[PDB]
Amino acid sequence: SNKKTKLIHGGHTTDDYTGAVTTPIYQTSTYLQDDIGDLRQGYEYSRTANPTRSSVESVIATLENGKHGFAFSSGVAAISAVVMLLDKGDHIILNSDVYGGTYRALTKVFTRFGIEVDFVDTTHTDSIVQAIRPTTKMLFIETPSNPLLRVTDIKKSAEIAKEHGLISVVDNTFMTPYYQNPLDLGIDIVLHSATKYLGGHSDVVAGLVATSDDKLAERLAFISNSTGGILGPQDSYLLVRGIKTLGLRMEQINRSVIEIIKMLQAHPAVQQVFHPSIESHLNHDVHMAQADGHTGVIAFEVKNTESAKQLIKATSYYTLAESLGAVESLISVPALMTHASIPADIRAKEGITDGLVRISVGIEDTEDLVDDLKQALDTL
Amino acid sequence: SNKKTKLIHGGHTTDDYTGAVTTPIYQTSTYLQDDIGDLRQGYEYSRTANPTRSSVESVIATLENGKHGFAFSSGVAAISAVVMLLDKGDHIILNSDVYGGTYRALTKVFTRFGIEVDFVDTTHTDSIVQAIRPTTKMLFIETPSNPLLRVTDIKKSAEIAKEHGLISVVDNTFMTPYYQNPLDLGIDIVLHSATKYLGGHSDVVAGLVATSDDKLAERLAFISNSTGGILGPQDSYLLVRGIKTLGLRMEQINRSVIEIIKMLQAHPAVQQVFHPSIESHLNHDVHMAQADGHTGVIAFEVKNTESAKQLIKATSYYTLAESLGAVESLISVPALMTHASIPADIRAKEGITDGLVRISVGIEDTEDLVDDLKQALDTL
Amino acid sequence: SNKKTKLIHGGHTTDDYTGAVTTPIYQTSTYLQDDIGDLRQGYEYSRTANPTRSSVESVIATLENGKHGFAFSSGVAAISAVVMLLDKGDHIILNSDVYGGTYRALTKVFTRFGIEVDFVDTTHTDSIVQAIRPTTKMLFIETPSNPLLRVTDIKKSAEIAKEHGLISVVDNTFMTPYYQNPLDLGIDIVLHSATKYLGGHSDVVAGLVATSDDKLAERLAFISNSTGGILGPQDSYLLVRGIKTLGLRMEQINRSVIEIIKMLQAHPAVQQVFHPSIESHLNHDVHMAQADGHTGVIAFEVKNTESAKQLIKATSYYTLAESLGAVESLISVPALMTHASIPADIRAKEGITDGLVRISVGIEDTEDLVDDLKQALDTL
Amino acid sequence: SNKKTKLIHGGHTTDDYTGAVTTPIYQTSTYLQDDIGDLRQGYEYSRTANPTRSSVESVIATLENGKHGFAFSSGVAAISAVVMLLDKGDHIILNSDVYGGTYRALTKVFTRFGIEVDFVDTTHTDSIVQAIRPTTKMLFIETPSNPLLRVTDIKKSAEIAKEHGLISVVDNTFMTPYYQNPLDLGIDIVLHSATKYLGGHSDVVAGLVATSDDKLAERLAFISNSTGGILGPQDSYLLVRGIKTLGLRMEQINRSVIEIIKMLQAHPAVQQVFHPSIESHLNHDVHMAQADGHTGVIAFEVKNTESAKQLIKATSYYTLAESLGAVESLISVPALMTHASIPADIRAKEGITDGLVRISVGIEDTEDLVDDLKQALDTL
Ligand SMILES: Cc1oc(Cn2ccc3ccc(Br)cc32)cc1C(=O)O
Ligand SMILES: Cc1oc(Cn2ccc3ccc(Br)cc32)cc1C(=O)O
Ligand SMILES: Cc1oc(Cn2ccc3ccc(Br)cc32)cc1C(=O)O
Ligand SMILES: Cc1oc(Cn2ccc3ccc(Br)cc32)cc1C(=O)O
Ligand SMILES: *Cc1c(COP(=O)(O)O)cnc(C)c1O
Ligand SMILES: *Cc1c(COP(=O)(O)O)cnc(C)c1O
Ligand SMILES: *Cc1c(COP(=O)(O)O)cnc(C)c1O
Ligand SMILES: *Cc1c(COP(=O)(O)O)cnc(C)c1O
Ligand code: NA
Ligand code: NA
Ligand code: NA
Ligand code: NA
Ligand code: NA
Ligand code: NA
Ligand code: NA
Ligand code: NA
């Protein structure tokens, strides 16, 4: 029925055989056959299918209202599997500020295989329509993006893709299935770095893909079995376990996000704040139409690099590490960590200033997170 | 010093910090930084590097006398990563009877990316030299192959590759690093389905790659980090643990292989036997020159499909399952299991008759395995 | 600072060496020594101490405001370790309705070792004072108890114990450290079945003990090392991971508990309801003085056994299983499951009627849990 | 049939449901019931029984030719469970040099519960007969013992126990079920620290108990369920996996033991050597009658403490750590490590001289182990 219930009872996450209320961990690679060709329960080799991985795939299919789930050894492994739906000469339209790993995979690996890519500003969907070439086969969007949380209209993206014969894909990592369901808005394929919010405990590197399209699911399954970027059974188990608390965690994170944003907007050491909940934010109305909550990633400007470093060293409950979606609240400076490859003047032009801080709100007490960040900003 | 010692003490498989005599399992995705950019021990995100995966990579590098190890989520994930060293328009020469998964990945995935492949009979290396095109960039050989155990001269393959500017690759799954070291014979890259002998307990799906070439290692590392088919930490741990007993297991398997082959050659219900230890076997001398032991995979002919089925049902210690390299002895009929896609007349032409049985010798008692298979054959 | 923050940052749950933001899993039994007697980090044999178990012990010590933590292979293993602080001839006072496993261990195991026990109604603390014998050495109370949730005054129990020289122990399983901290109220030892709320995912059987008393901690450590009921490293890891969400889960459970109780009191198929939040409940004022929230265990009367069975079969979101503290909501009939050993007339006398239902509220949506239970009760 | 086969196929270590060729890891605590009291497969709560633990229990029962297996969280947890078969006032006869942990548990824990113990020299069984009191209920022997490998006649011990109404127990850790089967010689209960040879990889702390006696099995099961020192499912899995290679490992260890002993006897820096394979060793004939192989633990005298320390620092393949039964070869000085509590003059009287070295032979190459130890001894 309601979401917190669906999180607990959606999918198949018990053992039919013993009745165990959690999915057994099938640390196994091959399965007995009673006769040549007769599989007891559909399992014959763990790369093709493993019952624990089948559990987590059923969960992600259920939570995204799809029919088919696929678990990969990372988010970029899932993204790669989806890109490998295409051939040499095919073209992909992506949003201009995709995740660095996606940009790197596309422009440094798949471009050598003749797959062509254009990164355009999808915050206006007519820029998608102009970017469409006779060779375009796929539209791939993140919303909201990193680290400036640009919002792209998912449903108009799906309509454009349907009308021009494109496979539409949404990287739904930042929102989770708890708040945003691209498959419900006409998208063909939804994917996640389960490394982030879904696993939620900074202890699994995993990717998840879901689709309702039988033929796309057949092609994704063939690609998974042939190239082999499968999630292992222990990691699939830890994903199922972490997803149990996704709703409770996202709602705690959302309460803290709202209060932290009021603080940031009021503080004098903070300039621009980037988050889709802010009403002046581009496509705020669109985000509210396609999601019923918010990501925990917030970016905001302090004055310079020295102010950013002092901010990080003055906090008690903000942890300096990479990734997002932990139970801990994480803090980082994109210009020094994720975007240090880009020349500084081009970082400035894009909005990745030297004093741009990104926090990933965790599940600590809301007042503690607000007060801690505020006193750290008071030292500036 | 000697191999059984190197298996126990080669690589880094203890904890420097606590002194734990086994590699800790880093069920983790991200790492604290004391200052922006300063990693405590070189770890910042588990897809890029994880200390347990680093353990297993050091082991495979050491055992193959390489300098660099890479752990992937499966054997075909490692094979795919190696093939992705190439671009659209590049050409690969492979042995004619490669593993079905390798054939499928190449002709159904990477061919769509403009990578061109030819499967030639590498048992005569001048067939490699004739197959070389101006676009050839890679030579990929398995030795011995499945299921007929054709042997390819590794050292002449390396010389040909060096002289024509090819990356040479050997799939060394069937021999393990215990018996055959391609990097020592001039090969650029050696790889394994660690799912088989190395893990050795039918409970990990994994791939391992090793190389001594710094620039190839840099390209493999970039491909791994960008496409993300990484082995998880629990599976890396179970690989380290299984590899500890590789020598003891391979030597038990080899004793049983020798006795089982004497039995098979003597039995009247058995026709041709395929194994590189048989002196009449093509390139037997070559195998003995490049390996100091044998694989546990044996194939032999019984009369027809009904005889094969009766053989399988009459054994007590031979398990009907897919894969190889278990502690259990595994039995299968390629024409009904791995090769049932190929039309029967073409299976016959290739030597995959309806009564071709493949066994993967396990570590049961030698006399039990011999006697069991013999009494089962006596029922024919 | 505040509780949800202390849950995330209390204890030591990162790797000092690599910086891993989660506790490494030391699947290991022994540790290198650089010189005879010099341990690198205090570890020499995993039964004595293991770094993952040390992590979970630091967490339970921190959350209960103690100084020493101990992880055992189950709740009854922790209870047994605490009882083994005594000698033949020593006497224990316990509350009259202790957990069946505690009653069984005491009257069927430790009584054979000359340890004497009396079960008295501790809801009036002067019954403790009367029960004190010259041989009494320990006072052991659960609050609230199972399945009728009788409340015992913890702070007066601690005063009585201090004045008469008794080791005071509280089984704090039902409340968790999130809501009730016996060590803060003068109790010597607090313990938990971490199998329930703390692990919180029905996938670890574990016990946790905490104390601030150095000499009791030394005796508990000696007992643990000598009798060996230690928690393994994988289970210690899963406990740390589950405890991360304890606050979010307990607060969801508490919201649902309040609404479910309003429903149960209003429904005509329900008679008596047992929970410490009900104002007419014995020692409600005491509970509110010693805890700032509620357990998720509720018991209530329906008419008979047939009504109980129909209730269980008519619910959609209530799972029929043993134990409590899951993410799922669990339902059971004590007279048929936990108390079926006791003759029925004595069950009736104690209040364990044939139609007594016990639910353990999970973290599903509150309205779904209320509506589901209500429609199931409407079928009666 | 033969032992190496029984190791692979004895017990139930596959999944009946999916056919998985390895035992699934049931990381779970409770099980669905279809109706109140009807368990799907006999599981209702993991402390009582867990399907992975059931797997390892079936293996130890099969390997010891018993009917009932029990897995505990450590060897001393299994020993404690067995001792708790007795009541206050009961008396136990043990061999004079029991494992320190057994001595400590008995004289510092269970003696406070009125269980009485005498440690006598069981190398002459008539010393058992003299030690029998009217209150004696149990006879507990290790053979061979640590660190001087004293041998006790198992079959005469069983006869004495049967004639006087004693429960007979053998701690069979040092021999493993591969070489010595006490239940076959009339013993009631056999137990193991599975931490050592059975797990065999220094990565599980576990105890195993086996018996053929239904009523003793019922009492052991009750004690296990009530006091809760159960092995967890991940550790039970790793035990099953390690036991697969027990035969191969023990046979490698035995080959190395024989050669190392020839070396030690020949070397001039070595005085007395203690091992049951030496023909002049007390009860050598008895050992050969009750076992068909040898333990890997050897003790030998060098001149003093300084010679022992130099020996340890001069070896390349001998690791200084606690415990035994690793894949690595372990070295230690009892007088400085396990026996440093005992006053030095009493250590001398017992034979634990300052220069007594104990090695636990691992599975490295035999010549490497011999040569390494010999060159290290040449530096003395
Ligand atoms: C972290 C990252 O993000 C991007 C996206 N991207 C591509 C060109 C480019 C120019 C300016 C900016 Br700002 C972003 C850009 C690339 C990378 C990378 O790791 O290479
Ligand atoms: C198991 C398998 O092996 C091969 C190799 N291969 C490719 C063409 C071909 C023709 C005859 C024979 Br025999 C083998 C052949 C393909 C497959 C597969 O799964 O498709
Ligand atoms: C589940 C259980 O709880 C108790 C407590 N206990 C002891 C005597 C007794 C009499 C009536 C009632 Br009601 C409870 C009683 C014992 C058991 C058990 O498993 O034996
Ligand atoms: C390692 C150890 O072994 C023993 C056995 N044990 C008991 C008395 C005694 C006297 C001399 C010698 Br030698 C051994 C003795 C006790 C301990 C311990 O840790 O206390
Ligand atoms: C409510 C519920 C659903 C339906 O979810 P929708 O969002 O309505 O598609 C599915 N599964 C379970 C277990 C549920 O409780
Ligand atoms: C002997 C030994 C080596 C050397 O192996 P080679 O086959 O000679 O290259 C490496 N590492 C360890 C631990 C060894 O014992
Ligand atoms: C706030 C806080 C504490 C203090 O908790 P008290 O309830 O005040 O004893 C301890 N540890 C951490 C990490 C905290 O954030
Ligand atoms: C041979 C065999 C046995 C019998 O072992 P014994 O030592 O004869 O009692 C039991 N189980 C299996 C699987 C065997 O192969
Ligand atoms: Na479900
Ligand atoms: Na669709
Ligand atoms: Na090493
Ligand atoms: Na080279
Ligand atoms: Na902390
Ligand atoms: Na105190
Ligand atoms: Na079996
Ligand atoms: Na018997």
Side-chain angles (χ1 to χ4, degrees), chain B residues 317, chain D residues 1-2 5-6 9-10 62 65:
Chain B
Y317 309 127
Chain D
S1 187
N2 288 334
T5 304
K6 187 178 170 180
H9 297 284
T62 290
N65 302 322

Side-chain angles (χ1 to χ4, degrees), chain B residues 186-188 212:
Chain B
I187 296 298
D188 294 313
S212 294

Side-chain angles (χ1 to χ4, degrees), chain D residues 199-212:
Chain D
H201 292 76
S202 316
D203 66 359
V204 174
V205 175
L208 291 174
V209 180
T211 184
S212 294

Side-chain angles (χ1 to χ4, degrees), chain A residues 1-2 5-6 9-10 65, chain C residues 317:
Chain A
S1 187
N2 288 334
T5 304
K6 187 178 170 180
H9 297 284
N65 302 322
Chain C
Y317 309 127

Side-chain angles (χ1 to χ4, degrees), chain A residues 194-209:
Chain A
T195 311
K196 320 288 171 69
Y197 290 112
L198 283 160
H201 292 76
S202 316
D203 66 359
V204 174
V205 175
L208 291 174
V209 180

Side-chain angles (χ1 to χ4, degrees), chain A residues 56 77 104 107 131 162 191 196 228 244 248 262 302 317 328:
Chain A
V56 77
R104 240 182 293 120
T107 66
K162 182 182 179 180
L191 61 80
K196 320 288 171 69
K244 308 295 184 188
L248 301 193
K262 300 168 163 166
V302 295
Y317 309 127
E328 299 91 346

Side-chain angles (χ1 to χ4, degrees), chain B residues 255-302 304-324:
Chain B
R255 294 186 291 263
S256 288
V257 156
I258 298 311
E259 300 306 308
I260 290 169
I261 284 169
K262 300 168 163 166
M263 189 273 292
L264 286 176
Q265 291 175 318
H267 202 281
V270 169
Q271 281 103 78
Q272 223 185 320
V273 186
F274 307 87
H275 191 269
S277 72
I278 300 167
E279 302 190 315
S280 76
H281 194 85
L282 166 65
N283 284 332
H284 165 86
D285 55 337
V286 167
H287 178 82
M288 298 311 266
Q290 66 193 18
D292 52 27
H294 292 295
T295 193
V297 180
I298 307 163
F300 57 96
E301 295 171 352
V302 295
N304 48 51
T305 280
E306 306 88 58
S307 286
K309 291 172 150 265
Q310 180 177 350
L311 192 50
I312 291 174
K313 302 215 91 103
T315 53
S316 316
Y317 309 127
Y318 291 79
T319 295
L320 179 73
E322 291 276 350
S323 192
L324 57 144

Side-chain angles (χ1 to χ4, degrees), chain D residues 8-11 13:
Chain D
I8 302 315
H9 297 284
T13 65

